[PDB]
Structures are given as structure tokens and as C-alpha cells.
Design a protein around this ligand. Structure first.
Ligand SMILES: *C(=S)NCCc1ccccc1
Ligand SMILES: *C(=S)NCCc1ccccc1
Ligand SMILES: *C(=S)NCCc1ccccc1
Ligand SMILES: [Cl-]
Ligand SMILES: [Cl-]
Ligand SMILES: [Cl-]
Ligand SMILES: [Cl-]
Ligand SMILES: [Cl-]
Ligand SMILES: [Cl-]
Ligand SMILES: [Cl-]
Ligand SMILES: [Cl-]
Ligand SMILES: [Cl-]
Ligand code: NA
Ligand code: NA
Ligand code: NA
Lengths: 114, 114, 114
């Protein structure tokens, strides 16, 4: 999978090893090889949640399979947990959009996964 | 819903109260509680529309329901109107991708909306 | 269509005219007037691919139609080729999410394409 997090939290508050932790945790959560996992963190964003600019985050998780009711609940617990612990963002100020991608709609290495 | 606007307009040109206005207007437009609305503005982007670097914007609106033919036309009029008035972006240089998300695919507060 | 590229490569490494090149190349690849094509490049991002922060990119291509198995493979060869040549990013460190949008879900000029 690939995970993206956009947040108003400042870059200086993103701890060393954050991308690495996300990569490993997502590998364990989806059972996928970490070598194909991509993570992207975007701090210092101009955003609001409920009209308030206290710390918040807007994220997305794309995956070819491994997306579903129970799985997404598990991913949300894991990811909100990491955002609260590492970036001090309250879980109720985090949204995560989940996308189950068809292999044919994911390009990589001059081709697709189809 | 959550609304994201990516634009080449510089940060200094984003007026005070913009995020607040988007939050209130989207709440009114969708009938959703403002406490749930998330807004994200990304200025100073390197982008082109029709090959031209004049002011433009690429946006997205995700919502669990309240997405449809007539509704999307109304949101586009509302949002393009705000971008034109506040950021001075011509409506024909704005694209807005609409997504009707399944509740199970939207994470929040350690779980999902399902 | 609209093409977005998020990458960790330096802004200084993005060639002048890259946005125009992407615009013209995509116009040819889709047989669409360049006037409709939007391109967005985001450099200097904090990201990792396979746990490594060597050059990589996360992209998306949204189009109303013209999305499919064979077409996406073609777009991937074209886009990875440009990223490798212009941004020096290895094709195997690039992901491109393809989206076939319904006209009703694409806002533009105060309305939608429906
Ligand atoms: C996790 S193994 N990501 C690798 C495949 C993928 C899935 C969705 C989007 C991009 C790449
Ligand atoms: C508007 S009420 N947003 C709150 C629920 C939501 C819907 C789609 C994506 C993220 C969050
Ligand atoms: C290519 S012709 N872009 C113009 C229509 C479009 C399609 C998808 C998303 C935004 C705009
Ligand atoms: Cl599941
Ligand atoms: Cl469950
Ligand atoms: Cl898909
Ligand atoms: Cl409708
Ligand atoms: Cl209508
Ligand atoms: Cl969905
Ligand atoms: Cl329920
Ligand atoms: Cl095809
Ligand atoms: Cl769609
Ligand atoms: Na899907
Ligand atoms: Na949908
Ligand atoms: Na689609």
C-alpha cells in the first residue's frame, strides 16, 4: 500500500523515523512486503477540522486488495494511534480515505500491476 | 465532507477567514454539521491549466452521500464562486473531483463511519 | 485529464518547461486539446518508497474515460519515461493511480461536465 498524511502540525514536530515506522507498521498490518510500500508526510498545512485549526490530519491509504470493513477499522486504529503518539493529533481530528485499487489502475515500472 | 484546494495563488493572497468561510458554506450546502467538516488549502503550487500558469486550482470534495448530478453542479457554482471572489481564480481554470465515499472507507477516531 | 506528481526530488531539479511538456505529451497521448489538461508538480516532499528516500514519486491521472488496461500501461510507459528523463526518478520507484471519473463528478466553470 501507499499512505499519505497531510497535517497542520509543523515539520519540526515530525520525529526522526516517522516514515520508517509507518512503512513497517503498514507492512505488518497488511502483511505486504515493506519494499513496495510508499509513505508520504506533508506537514505545515493550512487546514481546519470543525472550523478549528488545532492539530488535525487528512490521510489516504491506497491498496490493491486488503481493503474492507473490518480491515479498515483495524487500519484506522493503528494509524490514528501513530498520529496521536508521534504527532500529538487527536484521533477524532483525523480522516482517512481508503481506496481499493484495481491492479490495472495502478501504474509502476513503466507498466501496471494487471 | 472534506474539501481540498490546490492552487498556484501565493499564500499572501489567501484572505483571512477563508478556511472558516469554506467550512460554513459547505456545512450549509450539504446540511452536514460544521463540526465534521474539514478544509485544506494549499497555495504556492507549481501547476498549469491548459499549459498556462495563470491562477488555477485543482480541488476535491469527498462526502459520505450528498453527491450527485444536481448537487455537484450546485457545489461547483458555490466553490468556483468562492475561489473567484477570494482567490481571484477564473471558474474555467478550476477542476473539482467529487467522491461519494462508502462509510466503511472513511476512517475517523480509531475506526470508520460504517 | 489532470496529472499530479508528488516527489522528493528538489524543486531546482524540475526543468523549466516541464509542466508544458507534460501538458503537450498528455494531450497527444489522449487526443485531447491541451487547453483542458491540468498538471501539478510537487517537489521537495518528505516521502519514502520501500523504506528508502532515494528519488521516488507518487502520481495520479484523472480522466473522463480513456482509462483502461492497455491505455494505462501506455500512460505508465509515457509518464515513467518523462519522470526518469526529466527528474531522474527510476521507473520502479514510481506509482501512478489512475481514475476514470464520471462526468457528473468533475466540476468546472461553475458546473460539471455532465
Ligand atoms: C502496497 S504493497 N502498495 C504497493 C501497490 C500499490 C497499491 C495501491 C497504490 C499504489 C501502489
Ligand atoms: C463531511 S460531513 N465530512 C465528514 C465525513 C467524511 C466524508 C468523506 C471523507 C472524509 C470525511
Ligand atoms: C482532461 S481532458 N482533463 C479535462 C477533464 C477532467 C477529467 C478528470 C478530472 C478533471 C478534469
Ligand atoms: Cl475487511
Ligand atoms: Cl470489526
Ligand atoms: Cl480502481
Ligand atoms: Cl443530486
Ligand atoms: Cl441541475
Ligand atoms: Cl468508497
Ligand atoms: Cl451502523
Ligand atoms: Cl484500455
Ligand atoms: Cl467518478
Ligand atoms: Na475503489
Ligand atoms: Na464513490
Ligand atoms: Na472511477
Amino acid at each position: 500500500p501507499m499512505f499519505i498524511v497531510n497535517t497542520n502540525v509543523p515539520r519540526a514536530s515530525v520525529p526522526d523515523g516517522f516514515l520508517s515506522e509507518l512503512t513497517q507498521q503498514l507492512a505488518q498490518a497488511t502483511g505486504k512486503p515493506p519494499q513496495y510500500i510508499a509513505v508520504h508526510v506533508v506537514p505545515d498545512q493550512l487546514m481546519a477540522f470543525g472550523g478549528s485549526s488545532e492539530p488535525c490530519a487528512l490521510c489516504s491509504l491506497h491498496s490493491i486488495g486488503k481493503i474492507g470493513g473490518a480491515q479498515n477499522r483495524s487500519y484506522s486504529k493503528l494509524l490514528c494511534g501513530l498520529l496521536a503518539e508521534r504527532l500529538r493529533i487527536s484521533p477524532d481530528r483525523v480522516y482517512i480515505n481508503y481506496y481499493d485499487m484495481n491492479a490495472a489502475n495502478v501504474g509502476w515500472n513503466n507498466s501496471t500491476f494487471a
